[PDB]
Amino acid sequence: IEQVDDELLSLTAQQENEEQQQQRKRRRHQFAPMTLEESPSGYIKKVILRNFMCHEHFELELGSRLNFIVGNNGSGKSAILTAITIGLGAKASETNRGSSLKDLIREGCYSAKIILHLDNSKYGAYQQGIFGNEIIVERIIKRDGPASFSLRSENGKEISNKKKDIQTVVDYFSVPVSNPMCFLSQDAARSFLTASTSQDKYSHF
Amino acid sequence: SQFNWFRIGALYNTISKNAPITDHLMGPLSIEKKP
Amino acid sequence: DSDVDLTEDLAVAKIVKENPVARKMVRYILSRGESQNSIITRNKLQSVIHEAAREENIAKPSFSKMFMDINAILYNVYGFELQGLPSKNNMNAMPEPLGHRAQKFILLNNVPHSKNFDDFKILQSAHTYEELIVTGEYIGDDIASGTSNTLESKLSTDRDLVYKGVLSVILCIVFFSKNNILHQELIKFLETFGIPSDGSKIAILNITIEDLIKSLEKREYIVRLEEKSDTDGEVISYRIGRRTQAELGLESLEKLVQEIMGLEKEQTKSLHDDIIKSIGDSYSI
Amino acid sequence: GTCFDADMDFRASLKVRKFSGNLSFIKDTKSLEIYILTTNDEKARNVDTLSGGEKSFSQMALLLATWKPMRSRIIALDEFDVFMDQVNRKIGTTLIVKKLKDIARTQTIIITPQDIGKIADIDSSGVSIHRMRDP
Amino acid sequence: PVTGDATAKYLLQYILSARGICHENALILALMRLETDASTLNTEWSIQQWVDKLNDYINAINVKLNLLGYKIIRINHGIGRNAVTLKAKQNFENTAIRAHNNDYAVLQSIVLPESNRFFVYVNLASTEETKLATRFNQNEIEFMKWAIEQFMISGETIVEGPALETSIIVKEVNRILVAATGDSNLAKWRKFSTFTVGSTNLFQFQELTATDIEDLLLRLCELKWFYRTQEGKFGIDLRCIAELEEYLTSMYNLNTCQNCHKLAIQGVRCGNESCREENEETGENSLSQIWHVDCFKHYITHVSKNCDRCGSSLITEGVYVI
Amino acid sequence: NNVGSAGAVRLEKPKDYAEWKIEIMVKFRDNAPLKKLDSHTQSGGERAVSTVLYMIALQEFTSAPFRVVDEINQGMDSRNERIVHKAMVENACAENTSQYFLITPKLLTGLHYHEKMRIHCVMAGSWIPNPSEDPKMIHFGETSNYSFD
Amino acid sequence: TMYGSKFIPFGPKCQVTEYFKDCILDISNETTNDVEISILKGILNLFSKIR
């Protein structure tokens, strides 16, 4: 069967590409000696949502370790999680919050802005010399035209406008946005917490 | 499978033998865990 | 005598309230002697009474008092009563039942039988049996109908009735065969009804004949007397157990056999003497 | 490694309720079995042989012990108040607070409609409540 | 203990001999045949007082059972009115006398054209320290638990098509609907409920083989615990829900009918999509707003014909539960 | 059957006549799969019970008046030995059976004694007189001798 | 060889072990890697847990 040989060759070529990609990666941590108790960098200091879903331009200063948003249900309670998942970069189907990225835009407005402020002042920062003490991540969703980006810094200097820099920064900070369990929505949490059969627990884990 | 194996069985255990008959439902199926 | 019944019920309620362990023992007896329809042993009674007393931290009452309370509760609530059984060695080697000094006991009903209620039950069973196995079929996964016996019938589990019928046939064979029937000839006679003797499982029950006979012997329905010899070989003789003797009396056997052959009620005479002759040395009475 | 981290975190989580348990991963049955020993008994019964509150607490502890092996800088979660009823819900929120406020590597955003300020366990530092003034 | 005690004992023994649950008309006929030999012939009587003379004796047995640790519950069957009363040409009491349903009438002519409530012998004890088994081992108990879990899970249906399986329940539902109002246009909605449905899923048990599963299921069907429909789908009968009243409410989150507290197994359940809140996991009326068949008939023929669950039109209602 | 296990002595017959072999089905232990009898894989007591029962099966067919077994009642787990004693009791229930000279080097608590079989004791006591001088002590482990006939 | 000495001790709060693990998780891909990377990840996790 020549199809089996073709599949074998394709799998072998895929393994070759994967091992080249592994060989390409280098070390990214420099081990600044410095001083433990203090949180490392990368946490979200603040999120601002301008004309996003229901409410208007809104500021929210998230805490360093544990945050308890008490936005009541039916008042855009899930808007913050959707905004964080979209801004950090995630597949729309994985989020399952809204029919399309167009619907996330507030009705009556053509564009919506999601701006995140990751912290770089503390240790573990990603290029703290270039980005400074904060890294700003702003995503624009417009009804017409593609969704735009910029990974600007505190001074407003747009460091990049691409998306691969998003992935590099996020992977350096180790934020599993691609994993739909680190950012649990309502339905996912309900499915996990109500698991009864041991097989279901094994599957979910 | 031609003869009444129930009519004779109905005469027995009812007219004679005065044997108590109880369903004995599956009570131990729902055993409380008494936490 | 309504006031007599009311005060008897009040006394029974007071007795069952005074002795909580009695209620649990009655429940355990109603479970064991009815679910498995087996004979309750004397030895296990002391163990279960002691365990219940230790669990309830109540001083152990007298065994005779406990037995009397259990019988009173059964007669006042379910109408049942516990009758003692003799020892099997007495037969091998009017007697009032032991009651308190017997090694085995069995639940028995003690209310006279009516004339139409049993007729109603047997007629309902016959009506359901005409469609249970119509055209040589069976209910369950075999056909597309599950609630064949309407919403509820008298068929119970559709196999307990067959078991009781086979038991009655076996008892009639043993009782009327001079109280001495061999295994091979008993199988040959049962073959006339239609039960295969080649080892194939019987219908409905799905139990082989040898296993059915073993279960009957285990449940004290029959006794496997073994007068094995040499010229011929091993000899299996079937007897009547004490459980059957207690369940079936002279009048009870006469009533059962009256409808077996469909004899008219006018000729009821000269039949009890024949039944006694056929029974022979079977009852310790 | 992942199963070891999950097992250890589940054991450390059950200590909040004065329990002692473990996780068992079986490939023959392809199942995860939770064994919990509470104060009354002396044998680790199967987790299904328990009550609603204990099972809900075990499920929440399993959720945390599944978050643990995958070191995530940011974790976000929606409401859980409808899956736990009255006292068990308070105990579950207490477990979340106690197990998540200590770690500095992981920032957690919990979105709940229930007011945490009503819970007496708000005096602990490192917990940020942002109650929306606009309903 | 001359006449009344004997009659009470006979009634209780007849109830027990029918595997707990027994038809009320059978109990009425048994009481008639017991009383006709108790005090004269009782030819000149009325059913309106016969039902009371049965109910008082039932309560007298029930209080004794309660002080002993049991109870007889007059739980109404899911199917009611004439659909369950008809049975096979009413009560059973032709070349020979083998099939005569309308013959052997009690006294001159006695018949009960209405009967809905069934009497079931149940045990109120939960822990049940005294009893540990009846005739089965632990493997059968595990299989029974798995079957109960599968039946509970199968209650929720995703979409369902217009298959319109018409054996028993949907005929009565359509009769009630046309009695309430004559539409005959869209009464048969394309939404179905499979609360008691399973054919192949029960066969997927691991410990027991196919033959053992078949034997156990047949034995349970003969014991009147799991019943089969005309299609051939197994499901829990009234006996199981009558006994396990707390097992289906504590372990599994279930709601009651319009009554104070009762187990709903069949009837009408639409719920649209906005259920009461969101519940633990399942929705679509998983917290409240469920009706029986007789309950639905009573509710639709009285005031507030429309559903009280925040408003629901009759067009979308009429969901058949099997 | 008394062991609660199913087993049959099958004669597998391949095409070659010399390749015919004997298979024994084992079910006394659920963990142990159905295989030929062997000491290392199976426990000693279950194997001893199985081979003793196989010996017993080939007794009625044989014309030998009796069979002799030595070092058999010595304890096998006190459970397999109990069930093989039960099997021996059941075999002794049948009449015209071979007489076995049983040896019990180690005493077992709660041994079952059938009415058909009789136990013999050879132990001597300090307070018991010498067997030669005592007329009734010459018989050891016998009770029917004292009674008339 | 290093772990357990005065310079690199067992424990959860040491900085050196965190830096080592940070680099190991950087290289580790779990799809096409040298087994030594996964062995290091497991060993470093174990030594971090040891108090």
Swiss-Prot record, chain D:
It is found in: Nucleus; Chromosome. Signal peptide: none annotated. It comes from the Eukaryota. Component of the Smc5-Smc6 complex which consists of KRE29, MMS21, NSE1, NSE3, NSE4, NSE5, SMC5 and SMC6. Belongs to the SMC family. SMC6 subfamily. Present with 339 molecules/cell in log phase SD medium. Acts in a DNA repair pathway for removal of UV-induced DNA damage that is distinct from classical nucleotide excision repair and in repair of ionizing radiation damage. Functions in homologous recombination repair of DNA double strand breaks and in recovery of stalled replication forks. Probably plays a role in structure. The flexible hinge domain, which separates the large intramolecular coiled coil regions, allows the heterotypic interaction with the corresponding domain of SMC5, forming a V-shaped heterodimer. This is Structural maintenance of chromosomes protein 6. The gene is SMC6. The chain holds residues 970 to 1104 of 1114 of the full protein.
UniProtKB/Swiss-Prot annotation, chain E:
PANTHER family: NON-SMC ELEMENT 1-RELATED, NON-STRUCTURAL MAINTENANCE OF CHROMOSOMES ELEMENT 1 HOMOLOG. One of its GO terms (molecular function) is zinc ion binding. Pfam families: SMC_Nse1, zf-RING-like. The gene is NSE1. One of its GO terms (cellular component) is chromosome, telomeric region. Its EC number is 2.3.2.27. Component of the Smc5-Smc6 complex which consists of KRE29, MMS21, NSE1, NSE3, NSE4, NSE5, SMC5 and SMC6. Interacts with SMC5 and SMC6. Interacts with NSE3. A zinc finger (RING-type) spans 254-313. GO terms for biological process: chromatin looping; DNA repair; double-strand break repair via homologous recombination; postreplication repair; regulation of telomere maintenance. Belongs to the NSE1 family. It comes from Saccharomyces cerevisiae (strain ATCC 204508 / S288c). It catalyses: S-ubiquitinyl-[E2 ubiquitin-conjugating enzyme]-L-cysteine + [acceptor protein]-L-lysine = [E2 ubiquitin-conjugating enzyme]-L-cysteine + N(6)-ubiquitinyl-[acceptor protein]-L-lysine. It is an enzyme of class 2 (transferase). It is found in: Nucleus. Acts in a DNA repair pathway for removal of UV-induced DNA damage that is distinct from classical nucleotide excision repair and in repair of ionizing radiation damage. Functions in homologous recombination repair of DNA double strand breaks and in recovery of stalled replication forks. CDD domains: RING-CH-C4HC3_NSE1. Keywords: DNA damage, DNA recombination, DNA repair, Metal-binding, Nucleus, Transferase, Ubl conjugation pathway, Zinc, Zinc-finger. It comes from the Eukaryota. This is Non-structural maintenance of chromosomes element 1.
UniProtKB/Swiss-Prot annotation, chain F:
It is found in: Nucleus; Chromosome. Sumoylated by MMS21. It comes from the Eukaryota. Component of the Smc5-Smc6 complex which consists of KRE29, MMS21, NSE1, NSE3, NSE4, NSE5, SMC5 and SMC6. Acts in a DNA repair pathway for removal of UV-induced DNA damage that is distinct from classical nucleotide excision repair and in repair of ionizing radiation damage. Functions in homologous recombination repair of DNA double strand breaks and in recovery of stalled replication forks. Belongs to the SMC family. SMC5 subfamily. Present with 892 molecules/cell in log phase SD medium. The flexible hinge domain, which separates the large intramolecular coiled coil regions, allows the heterotypic interaction with the corresponding domain of smc6, forming a V-shaped heterodimer. This is Structural maintenance of chromosomes protein 5. It comes from Saccharomyces cerevisiae (strain ATCC 204508 / S288c) (Baker's yeast). The gene is SMC5. The chain holds residues 945 to 1093 of 1093 of the full protein.
Curated annotation (Swiss-Prot), chain G:
It is found in: Nucleus; Cytoplasm. It comes from the Eukaryota. Acts in a DNA repair pathway for removal of UV-induced DNA damage that is distinct from classical nucleotide excision repair and in repair of ionizing radiation damage. Functions in homologous recombination repair of DNA double strand breaks and in recovery of stalled replication forks. Component of the Smc5-Smc6 complex which consists of KRE29, MMS21, NSE1, NSE3, NSE4, NSE5, SMC5 and SMC6. Interacts with NSE5. This is DNA repair protein KRE29. The lineage of its organism: Eukaryota, Fungi, Dikarya, Ascomycota, Saccharomycotina.
